[PDB]
Symmetry: D2
Subunit: 58 residues, 4 copies
């Protein structure tokens, strides 16, 4: 089912950079599999992205 799990280390594949740990998930019609990622550089800051935008590292 889910591509990533809580605590996986991921980064953005392209475009704006982001890297850190999976800390949650979301699901919309536009993004049926999305993840919340907490920056490893900026503790407490979280961004949300579609699964296609992310890759696991490690």
């Amino acid at each position: 089912d889910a591509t990533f799990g809580m605590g996986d280390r991921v980064r953005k594949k392209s475009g704006a950079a982001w890297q850190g740990q999976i800390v949650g998930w979301y699901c919309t019609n536009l993004t049926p599999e999305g993840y919340a990622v907490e920056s490893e550089a900026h503790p407490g800051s979280v961004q949300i992205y579609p699964v296609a935008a992310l890759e696991r590292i490690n």
Copy 2:
């Protein structure tokens, strides 16, 4: 356990406004219970907030 569930209609209590449906969740040390909310006015747009920032309506 969780204050809200998927599909609950919520709004921001104060400050910047946001209103729509719960579409996910996240957990960080700064925000141990956070929610993703898809705007009911702006389909596909999602913002994330701590539970203390949100209230259920309906």
Copy 3:
């Protein structure tokens, strides 16, 4: 020079929806002409987008 000015009413062209007034601007190498847009539905909430993502309405 700038495509939009302060107070222009704009919306996202595609994808996640957003609509409201231009309230600022930003410039990065990835987004050399970006705008801050305050939602007309959700006062106080602001999102930032590249100019190519937005169109003026109205």
Copy 4:
């Protein structure tokens, strides 16, 4: 007038962390003096904050 200028290195004072360069500005009734900050750790990623949330470093 403005507290910061383009290219100033700033960080969040408290709460969620963010650090990098001023790349824009915004103005709303809730945030009459706001700044866009591009992360120095995550090139291309930009977050917006009220001036009270930021301090100049460096």
